[PDB]
Write a protein that binds this DNA or RNA. Sequence first.
RNA 1: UUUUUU
Length: 391
Amino acid sequence: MSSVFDEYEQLLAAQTRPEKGSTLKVEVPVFTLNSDDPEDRWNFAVFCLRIAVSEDANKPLRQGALISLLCSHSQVMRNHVALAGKQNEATLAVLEIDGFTNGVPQFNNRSGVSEERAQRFMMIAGSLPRACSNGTPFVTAGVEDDAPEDITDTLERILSIQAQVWVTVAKAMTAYETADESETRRINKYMQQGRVQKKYILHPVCRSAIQLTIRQSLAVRIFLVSELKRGRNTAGGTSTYYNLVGDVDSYIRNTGLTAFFLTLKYGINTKTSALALSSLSGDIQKMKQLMRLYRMKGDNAPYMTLLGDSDQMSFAPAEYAQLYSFAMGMASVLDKGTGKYQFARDFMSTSFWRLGVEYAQAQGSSINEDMAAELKLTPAARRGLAAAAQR
RNA sequence: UUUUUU
């Protein structure tokens, strides 16, 4: 016995099902450390940063510089750059920089390079943000001529630079989303932690450009995604770098799916009686559809934004406009968030907003079956807590 | 299509 609604669902299931050809693909130069000297890791990090922040070097190369700023943290970096090589979609090279001598400039290499190339980066060292001051990345001038006597502070500086990056990985879109203040709040609470010094802040202009670079490059984000997957996978007892990554992770995830999760929070997870209504159901049915599509998606699910796949479009807030508006109007009254921006659509319905207001304005109504059948609640207590809400 | 706080 096929029922009409049931076959309605059977129709809405086939549609929601989620080798790819090979195109032209450009080489990405990538740098690889070898050495055990703290001085050498220090110059490697300053160098990869002065590359990353170039005013004149082409794109793939700044990409590679950033890959290196994100790779430099490790000790044994052979296997981590092999894990870089594991991703067959792009194409990366090794360039064993073999270390540099006491003079900062020479890139002394044995394999696969040339001394004319031998003049460009160093030429590119000269690459400088005319807008940026002191002509250096770190805002306190007399910092980079420092002595890393031990490996621990060199690590810690690497951590701070990379974490400045990992913070700026969120709000990843292309327009200049202003997340400087939230970046600053997280820098401040990482100062509450203390793993990052106040002494090593970058220039925020160059940082936002580093962000713009991050999102213009496809595979550096893919590397971020794999970084973050191996971060979420590892437990607590480990090395500090994964702990920074996984700690910042919960701020990276779940991005751009925001109205969808507002609906989850306010619209549904409160199960107010107006949720039950004449029609709002159909969009609820589709809500649990995208739920099933979220769970059986799963392993790349908290990361579609960064991932970039078109399927999020299936996470369109627009088909929910009725529900979506209600859940919002209510959050607008009940919660005091989102009031400082335009978080609204033109495909909205006005009445269900008005009703989210009216329904949220009278908190006498929140009665749940759950606590009722939990505490054997009286009518006396019901009308009592009502008088409380009459405040 | 994207636009909080943690």
